[PDB]
Amino acid sequence: PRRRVIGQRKILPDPKFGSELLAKFVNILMVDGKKSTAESIVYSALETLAQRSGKSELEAFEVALENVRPTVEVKSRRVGGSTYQVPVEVRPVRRNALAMRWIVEAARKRGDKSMALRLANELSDAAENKGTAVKKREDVHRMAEANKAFA
Amino acid sequence: RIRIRLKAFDHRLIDQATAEIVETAKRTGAQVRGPIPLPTRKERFTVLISPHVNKDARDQYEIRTHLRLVDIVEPTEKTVDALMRLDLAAGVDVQISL
Amino acid sequence: RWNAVLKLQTLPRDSSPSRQRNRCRQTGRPHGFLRKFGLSRIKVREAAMRGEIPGLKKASW
Amino acid sequence: ARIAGINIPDHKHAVIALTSIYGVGKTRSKAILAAAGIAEDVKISELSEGQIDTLRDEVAKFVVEGDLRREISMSIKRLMDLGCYRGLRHRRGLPVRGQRTKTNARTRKGPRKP
Amino acid sequence: NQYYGTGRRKSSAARVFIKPGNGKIVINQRSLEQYFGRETARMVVRQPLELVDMVEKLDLYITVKGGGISGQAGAIRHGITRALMEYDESLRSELRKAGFVTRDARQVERKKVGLRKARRRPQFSKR
Amino acid sequence: RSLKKGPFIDLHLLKKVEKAVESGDKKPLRTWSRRSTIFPNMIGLTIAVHNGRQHVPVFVTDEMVGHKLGEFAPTRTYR
RNA sequence: CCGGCCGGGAACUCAAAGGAGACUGCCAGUGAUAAACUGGAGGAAGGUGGGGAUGACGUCAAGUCAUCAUGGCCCUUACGACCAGGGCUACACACGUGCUACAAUGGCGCAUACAAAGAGAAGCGACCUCGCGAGAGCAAGCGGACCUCAUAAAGUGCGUCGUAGUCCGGAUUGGAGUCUGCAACUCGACUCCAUGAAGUCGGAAUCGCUAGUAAUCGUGGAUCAGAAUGCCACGGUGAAUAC
Numbered sequence: 001p002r003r004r005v006i007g008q009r010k011i012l013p014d015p016k017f018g019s020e021l022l023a024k025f026v027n028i029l030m031v032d033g034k035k036s037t038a039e040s041i042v043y044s045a046l047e048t049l050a051q052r053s054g055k056s057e058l059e060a061f062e063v064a065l066e067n068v069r070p071t072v073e074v075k076s077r078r079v080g081g082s083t084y085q086v087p088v089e090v091r092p093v094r095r096n097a098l099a100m101r102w103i104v105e106a107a108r109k110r111g112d113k114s115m116a117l118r119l120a121n122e123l124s125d126a127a128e129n130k131g132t133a134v135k136k137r138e139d140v141h142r143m144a145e146a147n148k149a150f151a
Numbered sequence: 152r153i154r155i156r157l158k159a160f161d162h163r164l165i166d167q168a169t170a171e172i173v174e175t176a177k178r179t180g181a182q183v184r185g186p187i188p189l190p191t192r193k194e195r196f197t198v199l200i201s202p203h204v205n206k207d208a209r210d211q212y213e214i215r216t217h218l219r220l221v222d223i224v225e226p227t228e229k230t231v232d233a234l235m236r237l238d239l240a241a242g243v244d245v246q247i248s249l
Numbered sequence: 250r251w252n253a254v255l256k257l258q259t260l261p262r263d264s265s266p267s268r269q270r271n272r273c274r275q276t277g278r279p280h281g282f283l284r285k286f287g288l289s290r291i292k293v294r295e296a297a298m299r300g301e302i303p304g305l306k307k308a309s310w
Numbered sequence: 311a312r313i314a315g316i317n318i319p320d321h322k323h324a325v326i327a328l329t330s331i332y333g334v335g336k337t338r339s340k341a342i343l344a345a346a347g348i349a350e351d352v353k354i355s356e357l358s359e360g361q362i363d364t365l366r367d368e369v370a371k372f373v374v375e376g377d378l379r380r381e382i383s384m385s386i387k388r389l390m391d392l393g394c395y396r397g398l399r400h401r402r403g404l405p406v407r408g409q410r411t412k413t414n415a416r417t418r419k420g421p422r423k424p
Numbered sequence: 425n426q427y428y429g430t431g432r433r434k435s436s437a438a439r440v441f442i443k444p445g446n447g448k449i450v451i452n453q454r455s456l457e458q459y460f461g462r463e464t465a466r467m468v469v470r471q472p473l474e475l476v477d478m479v480e481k482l483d484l485y486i487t488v489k490g491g492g493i494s495g496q497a498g499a500i501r502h503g504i505t506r507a508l509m510e511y512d513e514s515l516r517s518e519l520r521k522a523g524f525v526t527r528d529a530r531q532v533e534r535k536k537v538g539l540r541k542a543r544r545r546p547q548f549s550k551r
Numbered sequence: 552r553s554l555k556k557g558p559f560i561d562l563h564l565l566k567k568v569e570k571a572v573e574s575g576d577k578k579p580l581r582t583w584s585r586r587s588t589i590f591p592n593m594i595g596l597t598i599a600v601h602n603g604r605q606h607v608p609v610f611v612t613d614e615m616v617g618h619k620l621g622e623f624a625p626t627r628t629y630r
Numbered sequence: 631c632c633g634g635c636c637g638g639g640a641a642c643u644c645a646a647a648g649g650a651g652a653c654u655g656c657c658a659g660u661g662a663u664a665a666a667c668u669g670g671a672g673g674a675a676g677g678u679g680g681g682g683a684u685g686a687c688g689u690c691a692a693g694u695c696a697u698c699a700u701g702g703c704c705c706u707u708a709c710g711a712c713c714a715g716g717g718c719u720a721c722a723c724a725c726g727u728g729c730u731a732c733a734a735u736g737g738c739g740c741a742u743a744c745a746a747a748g749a750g751a752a753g754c755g756a757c758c759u760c761g762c763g764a765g766a767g768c769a770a771g772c773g774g775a776c777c778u779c780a781u782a783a784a785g786u787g788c789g790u791c792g793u794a795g796u797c798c799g800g801a802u803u804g805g806a807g808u809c810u811g812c813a814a815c816u817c818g819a820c821u822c823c824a825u826g827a828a829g830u831c832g833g834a835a836u837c838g839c840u841a842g843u844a845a846u847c848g849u850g851g852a853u854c855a856g857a858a859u860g861c862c863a864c865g866g867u868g869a870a871u872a873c
């Protein structure tokens with residue numbers, strides 16, 4: 001907005017696992033307003049990732065999200081002239097949501113078998129740092145530190 | 152036994168008609184279950200407003216058909232037949248049935 | 250068919266409901282008509298806003 | 311094999327295999343398979359030849375392939391020669407069932423042209 | 425003894441009858457687990473009788489009508505929340521912090537004139 | 552093909568069929584009724600069908616069974 | 631006959647009449663001590679709670695002489711009146727608003743869930759019989775919380791397809807049918823069999839939406855003998871982001 005402060009309530013924690021981040025991930029991954037399909041797909045991918053990596057269930061995806069989160073983002077700014085890519089500081093929640101969106105879109109663009117396996121593959125290659133989410137992730141880091149004096 | 156239904160458009164006029172019916176029925180006899188609210192019909196209409204073009208200009212109207220039900224199982228007939236024909240029902244629709 | 254019974258169409262083809270248009274009653278408009286009040290959009294509203302039609306009220310559900 | 315046809319529906323399920331043949335749809339294929347008393351999920355090619363013979367005989371009972379093609383084509387030229395209103399639209403090329411030719415009639419007229 | 429709670433959410437009226445004993449949940453004269461509980465309100469119906477006490481402490485009989493999956497889920501949750509008068513209202517102090525006592529007044533918004541659903545305004549050409 | 556289970560024919564047009572058959576083909580008969588159905592009772596006959604301004608003659612044949620009288624009357628004019 | 635169906639009762643859902651409640655009201659802090667602002671408590675609902683109706687003085691010689699009325703002008707052996715057919719449905723192109731798709735968060739088969747709001751007397755039309763079908767015969771009940779339209783679809787439980795112009799996609803087209811109506815050819819709707827184009831996410835450019843919102847899934851109503859992807863209207867699932 002422009003005058004009134006806003007803030008959204010907190011979605012319910014993810015069923016059984018109780019992961020608020022996982023509940024937010026199903027929100028982002030949701031399509032056409034169908035939580036059942038999103039929940040089934042996320043659980044299938046989560047168990048596949050856990051059994052493939054030999055890691056636990058809760059933090060197996062936490063590692064990938066930690067390793068695919070950025071630090072600064074370029075904001076199109078033009079005070080006197082044309083557009084300047086001015087990098088800025090990323091808020092905590094904004095960083096988390098941006099990494100989550102990156103993972104979801106990276107899984108979207110794949111074609112391996114189906115969402116259940118594509119999400120697991122994205123998580124694995126994000127843990128390893130050889131995926132496409134990470135490939136897009138390093139771009140902001142390389143484009144940072146361009147124009148500081150401007151604001 | 153004898154079930155009576157009253158229809159009108161106003162909510163308080165039907166209430167006073169039902170009050171008159173029940174008061175006369177209890178005076179002349181007994182065994183009155185009182186009026187029953189039952190659903191109320193909401194006939195909804197919408198009409199274009201401008202006499203030419205201007206499709207967006209519309210007006211919404213609604214008619215509230217209120218309905219009341221009251222039944223009596225009085226044994227004696229000389230009370231019900233006397234109750235009939237003496238009541239104007241506050242000038243709204245009313246029906247007699249068994 | 251059964252014999253020439255169908256051919257008995259010598260009627261002026263006016264009694265058939267298809268011939269009647271069911272226009273308005275005060276002025277007469279082919280369009281903007283409703284069965285309930287038997288008038289047409291415009292006229293209806295005039296009556297409702299003037300308070301002629303019983304039980305008609307603005308809808309604000 | 312061609313199964314009283316020309317197409318070789320290999321490594322494919324029964325109903326789809328017979329659907330791949332001209333002049334036969336899903337319902338007609340269901341009729342053929344049920345009459346032949348063959349399972350539906352079993353592949354046509356993986357099946358034994360004793361049943362392919364019965365399928366040949368069963369399929370030969372309906373008008374299909376070039377026979378049906380010529381039958382339907384002959385009707386077109388016939389309604390063209392009759393001079394019917396429904397037929398003289400074919401010679402020009404445009405909707406004949408009564409669609410609107412002003413727009414959304416490009417499927418039968420082909421891509422646009424100035 | 426018997427204890428009653430109404431429960432409502434999106435024109436989804438419930439009826440919850442809590443009582444002592446160590447029985448199971450019953451919704452619509454039938455088991456919730458039989459009625460697809462593992463995804464239908466998998467952990468919505470059994471919210472209120474988790475935080476304050478254990479599930480296997482009070483028998484109950486629920487029956488809800490009208491609504492959908494989440495409609496029934498929320499209606500039963502609200503009814504149970506307002507059906508835990510086992511000992512005074514000391515538990516409502518804790519349930520207030522969790523926010524389960526208040527219902528969800530949010531409802532489907534009517535369809536306006538000149539719009540498609542409620543706020544989908546038909547697109548216009550040029551400006 | 553469609554339209555119930557039986558054909559329809561006009562009566563003041565059905566008055567001309569019997570005369571035409573009894574007296575043989577003499578000349579096409581001018582009429583307006585674009586409703587009658589080519590029934591076998593017409594091989595070897597010519598009928599003039601109205602289109603609005605002029606009555607176009609048309610000769611009936613053997614393979615016009617499911618085709619109506621007004622069918623062979625082009626009302627759309629093109630360049 | 632273990633079906634709320636039958637004795638009964640009215641607690642409860644619910645239905646419809648009347649009331650209570652929310653008013654910055656009680657506290658803390660900020661503020662020229664005032665208005666007011668921030669926060670907390672209580673409370674189902676905290677700050678005109680959500681939504682609708684409600685549209686100031688005026689502008690655009692904005693729209694309607696065609697809804698109707700009306701000043702002036704004109705026709706009145708025709709610019710009036712009756713009828714058949716035709717036309718408003720044309721079609722080398724362009725634009726606007728929509729529907730259906732390009733598929734695996736899917737398609738198909740079996741099973742199986744959970745809703746609201748409406749109409750019904752030349753009308754809604756159970757059940758039963760015939761038909762692969764649109765439908766036909768019989769035809770109770772219902773001027774209505776009773777009967778009918780009317781077994782909501784998404785959803786979930788199993789099996790199949792395994793990434794292709796395909797079991798996606800349905801236009802076009804041929805044959806055969808159902809049904810309203812004096813009348814389905816110009817020019818209607820629906821059904822059965824067959825064929826199965828384009829289309830594999832879309833340039834410049836541009837549109838809506840901040841919470842039950844958007845997104846997507848069904849149902850109804852008016853006009854109406856027979857007609858919706860349009861208009862009006864009800865509900866299910868249900869987000870992301872506002873520095």
Ligand SMILES: [Mg+2]
Pocket residue numbers: 267
């Ligand atoms: Mg008509």
Ligand SMILES: [Mg+2]
Pocket residue numbers: none
């Ligand atoms: Mg006049």
Ligand SMILES: [Mg+2]
Pocket residue numbers: 206546
């Ligand atoms: Mg519009």
Ligand SMILES: [Mg+2]
Pocket residue numbers: 532541
């Ligand atoms: Mg909706």
Ligand SMILES: [Mg+2]
Pocket residue numbers: 676
């Ligand atoms: Mg407060």
Ligand SMILES: [Mg+2]
Pocket residue numbers: 684
């Ligand atoms: Mg006001």
Ligand SMILES: [Mg+2]
Pocket residue numbers: none
């Ligand atoms: Mg002007």
Ligand SMILES: [Mg+2]
Pocket residue numbers: none
């Ligand atoms: Mg003008």
Ligand SMILES: [Mg+2]
Pocket residue numbers: none
């Ligand atoms: Mg005429």
Ligand SMILES: [Mg+2]
Pocket residue numbers: 718
């Ligand atoms: Mg027109």
Ligand SMILES: [Mg+2]
Pocket residue numbers: 408719
């Ligand atoms: Mg048409």
Ligand SMILES: [Mg+2]
Pocket residue numbers: 737
């Ligand atoms: Mg399909």
Ligand SMILES: [Mg+2]
Pocket residue numbers: none
């Ligand atoms: Mg109707």
Ligand SMILES: [Mg+2]
Pocket residue numbers: 192
């Ligand atoms: Mg009703």
Ligand SMILES: [Mg+2]
Pocket residue numbers: none
């Ligand atoms: Mg077909």
Ligand SMILES: [Mg+2]
Pocket residue numbers: 795830
């Ligand atoms: Mg493809």
